[PDB]
Write an enzyme that holds these catalytic residues in place. Structure first.
Site, mmCIF file in Angstrom:
data_model
loop_
_atom_site.group_PDB
_atom_site.id
_atom_site.type_symbol
_atom_site.label_atom_id
_atom_site.label_comp_id
_atom_site.label_asym_id
_atom_site.label_seq_id
_atom_site.Cartn_x
_atom_site.Cartn_y
_atom_site.Cartn_z
ATOM 1 N N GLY A 29 5.183 12.866 1.928
ATOM 2 C CA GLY A 29 6.008 11.888 1.235
ATOM 3 C C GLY A 29 5.142 10.697 0.875
ATOM 4 O O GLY A 29 3.912 10.790 0.904
ATOM 5 N N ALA A 30 5.781 9.578 0.540
ATOM 6 C CA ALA A 30 5.059 8.357 0.186
ATOM 7 C C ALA A 30 4.340 7.778 1.402
ATOM 8 O O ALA A 30 4.977 7.305 2.354
ATOM 9 C CB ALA A 30 6.005 7.320 -0.442
ATOM 10 N N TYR A 31 3.010 7.856 1.365
ATOM 11 C CA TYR A 31 2.112 7.243 2.362
ATOM 12 C C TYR A 31 2.224 7.801 3.788
ATOM 13 O O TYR A 31 1.994 7.083 4.767
ATOM 14 C CB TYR A 31 2.255 5.710 2.370
ATOM 15 C CG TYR A 31 2.425 5.075 1.003
ATOM 16 C CD1 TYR A 31 1.416 5.158 0.038
ATOM 17 C CD2 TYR A 31 3.588 4.375 0.685
ATOM 18 C CE1 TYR A 31 1.568 4.563 -1.219
ATOM 19 C CE2 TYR A 31 3.752 3.779 -0.567
ATOM 20 C CZ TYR A 31 2.742 3.877 -1.511
ATOM 21 O OH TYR A 31 2.906 3.288 -2.744
ATOM 22 N N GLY A 32 2.558 9.085 3.901
ATOM 23 C CA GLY A 32 2.656 9.746 5.204
ATOM 24 C C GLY A 32 3.265 11.131 5.129
ATOM 25 O O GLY A 32 3.842 11.511 4.104
ATOM 26 N N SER A 33 3.132 11.887 6.219
ATOM 27 C CA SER A 33 3.674 13.244 6.294
ATOM 28 C C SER A 33 5.099 13.263 6.861
ATOM 29 O O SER A 33 5.486 12.390 7.647
ATOM 30 C CB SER A 33 2.756 14.152 7.117
ATOM 31 O OG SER A 33 2.675 13.706 8.458
ATOM 32 N N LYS A 49 9.354 10.564 8.855
ATOM 33 C CA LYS A 49 8.051 10.266 8.279
ATOM 34 C C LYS A 49 7.227 9.380 9.193
ATOM 35 O O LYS A 49 7.633 8.273 9.542
ATOM 36 C CB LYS A 49 8.175 9.645 6.881
ATOM 37 C CG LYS A 49 6.822 9.373 6.200
ATOM 38 C CD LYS A 49 6.968 9.114 4.702
ATOM 39 C CE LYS A 49 7.609 7.770 4.416
ATOM 40 N NZ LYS A 49 7.550 7.413 2.962
ATOM 41 N N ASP A 164 11.889 7.187 -2.816
ATOM 42 C CA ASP A 164 10.580 6.603 -3.184
ATOM 43 C C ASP A 164 10.584 5.426 -4.179
ATOM 44 O O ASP A 164 9.659 5.294 -4.988
ATOM 45 C CB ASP A 164 9.627 7.697 -3.696
ATOM 46 C CG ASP A 164 9.218 8.691 -2.614
ATOM 47 O OD1 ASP A 164 9.248 8.352 -1.407
ATOM 48 O OD2 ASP A 164 8.841 9.819 -2.985
HETATM 49 C C1 LIG Z 1 9.862 14.674 0.604
HETATM 50 N N1 LIG Z 1 10.733 13.818 1.424
HETATM 51 C C2 LIG Z 1 10.313 12.515 1.807
HETATM 52 O O1 LIG Z 1 9.193 12.082 1.453
HETATM 53 C C3 LIG Z 1 11.137 11.702 2.583
HETATM 54 O O2 LIG Z 1 10.669 10.444 2.930
HETATM 55 C C4 LIG Z 1 11.271 9.610 3.843
HETATM 56 C C5 LIG Z 1 11.757 8.384 3.388
HETATM 57 C C6 LIG Z 1 12.382 7.504 4.267
HETATM 58 C C7 LIG Z 1 12.509 7.853 5.612
HETATM 59 F F1 LIG Z 1 13.110 7.004 6.459
HETATM 60 C C8 LIG Z 1 12.015 9.073 6.075
HETATM 61 C C9 LIG Z 1 11.393 9.954 5.190
HETATM 62 F F2 LIG Z 1 10.931 11.137 5.648
HETATM 63 C C10 LIG Z 1 12.391 12.180 2.986
HETATM 64 C C11 LIG Z 1 12.823 13.457 2.619
HETATM 65 C C12 LIG Z 1 14.075 13.935 3.017
HETATM 66 N N2 LIG Z 1 14.469 15.169 2.659
HETATM 67 C C13 LIG Z 1 13.660 15.964 1.903
HETATM 68 N N3 LIG Z 1 14.083 17.199 1.549
HETATM 69 C C14 LIG Z 1 13.354 18.049 0.619
HETATM 70 C C15 LIG Z 1 13.400 19.490 1.108
HETATM 71 C C16 LIG Z 1 12.095 19.875 1.788
HETATM 72 O O3 LIG Z 1 12.378 20.453 3.067
HETATM 73 C C17 LIG Z 1 13.981 17.999 -0.773
HETATM 74 C C18 LIG Z 1 13.761 16.674 -1.499
HETATM 75 O O4 LIG Z 1 12.363 16.491 -1.751
HETATM 76 N N4 LIG Z 1 12.441 15.519 1.501
HETATM 77 C C19 LIG Z 1 12.004 14.282 1.842
#
Ligand SMILES: Cn1c(=O)c(Oc2ccc(F)cc2F)cc2cnc(NC(CCO)CCO)nc21
EC number: 2.7.11.24
Length: 345
Positions: A29-33, A49, A164
């Site tokens: 995701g944005a700036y981390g896994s 994250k 994001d």
């Molecule tokens: C790609 N991604 C993030 O970067 C993401 O980032 C965060 C932001 C705020 C936060 F508090 C926590 C996070 F993890 C959350 C997130 C939630 N669901 C999903 N589900 C995906 C399905 C894949 O299993 C579909 C949408 O891409 N992906 C996420």
């Protein structure tokens, strides 16, 4: 009270409260896994994250503070919210890791479009939710700046959240989705830009949901601009003046003038109300683009629009953005925000 933390190697050692079980890598995701997990306390599937080196530089520390500030503020159905934020650290002195928790979402909008047209009713519902979330976001003077189908997550019932909100030169280069939804004024840095950049992105997304095809799939910045100008026409004198970049304005003037195309002949078979909205969103002069609040009241959304169920946001203080601070000062501000977190109802 401080929960008990347990350790686990994922992606890096993850140290999370016991409530979070069945942690499973879900990607980046944005700036981390990101890890999927089961929150035993709420019964929710969650995304966790862990930020990578949150305080390794001033730029990183400020970015960490920024993301935490944004996520703590956002309390809207159609916007990603913060369920939890935690650190194993017992004090500021030992504080070095930040974990963010939100709802696990089922798919993004890329997965749903999948080279295929959606029905007009599906487009109505999906765009409605985007605009509902953007009205909220914009009412807080927050700009997404990078809206694209991959940032738009949906559950089984097509309930949508924006992720994001609030990219390097290389990843904006060439035939890439990272640039396809960008308003021309930000893509080529014409001017000091505002909220309406996001409305341009919504137009691009909406057209894609309607045709199943990328609206402006440019092979590069220049190709994309020509694609854009072929549809909406070359800028008039009025817009030209507003291009504060002498260099960009000069390039614009080298192009052969083209008139705006007929959108009904571009979007054959589409709801005329959809065509009309696209025309109002895909205006080159950002001053003249429809806003989110105005778009929600457009006839195309008659069956969803409710003025009494489209909330605005509380004021968001982002004076920190123009503030110069040291790493440990940004870190201390971040720590305060973590400590002060109150979970949603
Ligand atoms: C790609 N991604 C993030 O970067 C993401 O980032 C965060 C932001 C705020 C936060 F508090 C926590 C996070 F993890 C959350 C997130 C939630 N669901 C999903 N589900 C995906 C399905 C894949 O299993 C579909 C949408 O891409 N992906 C996420």
């Amino acid at each position: 009270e401080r929960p008990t933390f347990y350790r686990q190697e994922l992606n890096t050692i993850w140290e999370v409260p016991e409530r979070y079980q069945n942690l499973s890598p879900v990607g980046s995701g944005a700036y981390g896994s990101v890890c999927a997990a089961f929150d035993t306390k709420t019964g929710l599937r969650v995304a966790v994250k862990k930020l990578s080196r949150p305080f390794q530089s001033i730029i990183h520390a400020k970015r960490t503070y920024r993301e935490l500030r944004l996520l703590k503020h956002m309390k809207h159905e159609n916007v990603i919210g913060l369920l939890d934020v935690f650190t194993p650290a017992r004090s500021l002195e030992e504080f070095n890791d930040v974990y963010l928790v939100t709802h696990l979402m089922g798919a993004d909008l890329n997965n749903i479009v999948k080279c295929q047209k959606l029905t007009d009713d599906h487009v109505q519902f999906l765009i409605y939710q985007i605009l509902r979330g953007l009205k909220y976001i914009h009412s807080a003077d927050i700009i997404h700046r990078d809206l694209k189908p991959s940032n738009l997550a949906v559950n089984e019932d097509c309930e949508l959240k924006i992720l994001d909100f609030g990219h390097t030169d290389d990843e904006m280069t060439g035939y890439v989705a990272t640039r396809w939804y960008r308003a021309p004024e930000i893509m080529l840095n014409w001017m000091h830009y505002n909220q309406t950049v996001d409305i341009w992105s919504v137009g691009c997304i909406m057209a894609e949901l309607l045709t199943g095809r990328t609206l402006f799939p440019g092979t590069d910045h220049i190709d994309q601009l020509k694609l854009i100008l072929r549809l909406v026409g070359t800028p008039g004198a009025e817009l030209l003046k507003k291009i504060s970049s002498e260099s960009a304005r000069n390039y614009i003037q080298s192009l052969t003038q083209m008139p705006k195309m007929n959108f009904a002949n571009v979007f054959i078979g589409a709801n005329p109300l959809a065509v009309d909205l696209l025309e109002k969103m895909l205006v080159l002069d950002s001053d003249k683009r429809i806003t989110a609040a105005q778009a929600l009241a457009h006839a195309y959304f008659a069956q969803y629009h409710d003025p009494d169920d489209e909330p605005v946001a509380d004021p968001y203080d982002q004076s920190f953005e123009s503030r110069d601070l040291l790493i440990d000062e940004w870190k201390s501000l971040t720590y305060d925000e973590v400590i002060s977190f109150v979970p949603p109802p």
